[PDB]
Structure 1
Amino acid sequence: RFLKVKNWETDVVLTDTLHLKSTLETGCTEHICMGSIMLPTKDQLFPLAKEFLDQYYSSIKRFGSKAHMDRLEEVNKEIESTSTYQLKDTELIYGAKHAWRNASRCVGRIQWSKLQVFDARDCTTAHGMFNYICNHVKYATNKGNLRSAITIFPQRTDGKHDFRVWNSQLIRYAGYKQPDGSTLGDPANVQFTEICIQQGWKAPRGRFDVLPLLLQANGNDPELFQIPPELVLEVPIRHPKFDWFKDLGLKWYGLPAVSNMLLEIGGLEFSACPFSGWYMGTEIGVRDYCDNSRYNILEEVAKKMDLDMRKTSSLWKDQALVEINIAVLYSFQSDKVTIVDHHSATESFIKHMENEYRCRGGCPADWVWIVPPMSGSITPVFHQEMLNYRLTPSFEYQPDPWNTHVW
């Protein structure tokens, strides 16, 4: 019931008790592990509220205080009356930071307590949402000195007045299918690139077109908005050794801002809560550039390096992958845009893990996601045993809006 995790490179052993406070389900059973599966009313509400307020008031050293008891009293009143309740700003901020702190798949959590929270619960329209989103982008970007931020729109009421950002990220490049057969731009965004066009967007049908925002307020039909180009910081990609690299004509944006997740706090659901930090190099160079179902330019780059692409055993893909990732990092660093390499980030995470075991009794961590997509075993997280479990507040997945929206 008290679980131990071992690091095999250092022999360090941590003891986890935090998992006992876990409440949601993993998808695993004692007969089967699902660790590599990507996607596994009033009476329901008050225990959920109670649980949250319990941990909040414990965190400020007023567990069992009159304020705690009164707040519990007040929230219970509000629930029986209104069939929901509203979070105080302090509780909202706490809940957002803790959803990040609890995100078992995030390697960047050493930063969790420095999150800038923007309360947008007074928002009523898509133009309103647009304004808040623009403010978020400008603040987070900070001319290249990136700052973590989340903007929180009004909570779900009854599933009919949902606020939703339809983009998966605030900033992404368009993808177009050809008659020629292949794909121009980003293949992951083909379906969304088409819905925007199916909606009125006029595409420059280029290789790297910044997608428009598609914003849904209060359950209404979503509207297109173009993000002011001066708010979208981009980094041209060059290599510090290969002069022909620049000629490839690649660039990427500095701000990773995830916008399709659901934030759960005290039973309350925030369906629109775009958040942003800064990139780890491999998200762009390994996943975005080199994935087969994405920009997939490994071959192109290998050619210009004139590697023997004859047999897989020359490891030409491995060689190209590395140079690319060197370029991504070189480019952002040169341009004073915040980026972290996978070595630094995983080293930071090990330190964060040890902090959390110390000050909290554990740290839920999903190895399958924490270990980077290249050079896995030369990073310290590879040799680290991790326990995965779900804590709340939390970020959850939710269905794509176009599959659900009562149109």
Structure 2
Amino acid sequence: RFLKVKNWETDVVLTDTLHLKSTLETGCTEHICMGSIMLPVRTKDQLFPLAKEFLDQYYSSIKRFGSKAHMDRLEEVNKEIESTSTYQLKDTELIYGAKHAWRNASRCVGRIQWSKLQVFDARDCTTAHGMFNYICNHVKYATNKGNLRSAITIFPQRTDGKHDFRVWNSQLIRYAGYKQPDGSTLGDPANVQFTEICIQQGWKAPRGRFDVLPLLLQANGNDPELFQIPPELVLEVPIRHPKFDWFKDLGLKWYGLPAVSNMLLEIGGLEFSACPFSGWYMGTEIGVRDYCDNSRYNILEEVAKKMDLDMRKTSSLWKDQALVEINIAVLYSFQSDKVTIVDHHSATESFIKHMENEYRCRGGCPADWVWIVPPMSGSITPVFHQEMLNYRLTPSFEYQPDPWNTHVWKG
């Protein structure tokens, strides 16, 4: 079967066949679309087909499908599963697997970069201290003094689900948030609960507006342990504006390295519950979401005050005006400090070229329009006008619940 998508700006029509390899469910049915819903232990029996599907894809990718090396590897993995109930990936398979999970990430606008990913194999790690060291090395490598390089570090896979490796932080680098007795928040309101956990585990909080959180690291199902990332490894950018010299005295800064650490990587039916990965920011993440969401740093009003905008009616579009200036400031600041960043026009134009390439080469590119379209200026980017098909390919990155909800405390 064939599915077509149309671009309403260019009239370019693409044909998807790749969706035929989709397996997992979307949440949608013929009666209900759940496209805007954010969130819509394996047996030997379920595992071997998953392993086989993966190895088939890997061996096809290297043009060795059906070879003796292919057949011997299927055999070897089958025998490993029957005997030990799981199996180990070869390094080459792990690399291919991590790159493909990114390639298949339908919510990622940055996927033009998918084949350039440094994979750090941390499967020999056994303790939280070992995790800390791996993560420091990742941060220093990825940061590269501002010349950011994509990377992922992969800790040992799930076994019985009682021995999971987990990074409790949602991102490797994030600022603390502190709920005040008067109900106001100091720092990042998104991180209040997690900050509270760190404090309870014995973190001495500075209680400022941009305090880098400690890592809380769980190895082998053990209770997590706290570690401070060396501050010299945490590259930050003070935010200033090219024309407005008062912008600096807002006292804003942000960190250069966006590094998601709470997702689960599935390759061939194996589950890597700790697999922190990093790239570089698109500016709107910081300037639109982190700074301007009402339940984040929420700076729109203060910015618009300083610009002397008419604030008595929303129809002056004061919020939109202040939003654009904050985003100019984030891009200018990163660029001035030589820290990699991409603007939303750049990024979406590159995404459309990536997607067209994938359609030709691969027969499709699953994409989640709700996430791919930037949170400002949506329709002046080419992705707004592009129809997309969202479906689930493996290998994949998946959301998993926060570990504090599920962890069995050892004490």
Interval containing the TM-score (normalised by the shorter chain)? over 0.9
Whole-angstrom distance in 1 between the partners of 2:373 and 2:213: 30
Corresponding residue number in structure 1 for 2:210: 208
Secondary structure of 1:184's partner?
Answer: strand
> Matched residues in 2 for 1:83 and 1:297: separation?
53
Query: Partners in 2 of 1:204 and 1:86 — Cα distance?
Result: 43
Q: Distance in 2 between matches of 1:285 and 1:211?
A: 21
Partner Cα distance (2:180, 2:122) in 1: 40
What is the deviation of 1:203? 0.5
Shift of 1:271: 0.2
Structure 2, unmatched stretches of 5+, are none
Q: Distance in 2 between matches of 1:178 and 1:22?
A: 47
Distance, in Å, in 2 between the alignment partners of 1:181 and 1:187 is 11
Does 1:3 find its partner at 2:35? no
Quote how far apart the aligned CAs of 1:80 are.
0.4
Aligned length: 407
Q: Distance in 2 between matches of 1:402 and 1:21?
A: 35
Distance 1:241 1:191 in 2: 37
Cα root mean square deviation, aligned? 0.4
SS of 1:75 mapped into structure 2: helix
* Offset from partner CA, 1:99-147 (integer Å, 9 cap, x none): 0000000000000000000000000000000000000000000000000
CA distance in 1: counterparts of 2:20 and 2:182, whole angstroms: 56
Give the secondary-structure state (helix, strand or coil) at the position aligned to 2:326. helix
Deviations 1:289-341 (A, max 9, x none): 00000000100000000111000000000000000000000000000000000
Deviation at 1:179, TM superposition (A): 1.4
Q: SS state of the match for residue 347, structure 1?
A: helix
Give the distance between the partners of 2:182 and 2:226, measured in 1 at CA: 29
What residue number does 1:352 align with?
A: 354
1:31-90 deviation per Cα after TM superposition (whole angstroms, max 9, x unaligned): 110000000110000000000000000000011101101100110000000000000000
Post-superposition Cα deviations, 1:331-367, rounded to whole Å, max 9, x if no partner, equal: 0000000000000000000000011001100000000
Cα distance in 2, alignment partners of residues 287 and 188 from structure 1: 11
Q: How many angstroms apart in 2 are the aligned matches of 1:173 and 1:84?
A: 38
Q: TM-score, normalised by structure 2?
A: 0.99
Q: Using the TM superposition, give the Cα deviation of residue 211 of structure 1 relative to its aligned residue in structure 2, in angstroms.
A: 0.2
How far does residue 261 in structure 1 lie from its aligned partner after superposition? 0.1
Q: Following the alignment from structure 2 to structure 1, what is the Cα–Cα distance between the partners of residues 215 and 170? A: 10
After TM superposition, list the pairs within 5 Å mapping 1:90-239 onto structure 2. 90-239=92-241
Deviations 1:360-379 (A, max 9, x none): 00000000000000000000
Structure 1: distance between partners of 2:222 and 2:329: 43
CA distance in 1, matches of 2:274, 2:175: 21
User: What TM-score, normalized by structure 1, do the two folds share?
Assistant: 1.00
Per-residue deviation, 1:180: 2.0
Secondary structure of residue in 2 paired with 1:241: coil
Partners in 1 of 2:359 and 2:368 — Cα distance? 15
CA distance in 2, matches of 1:205, 1:240: 30
Three-state SS of the structure 2 residue aligned to 1:169 is: coil
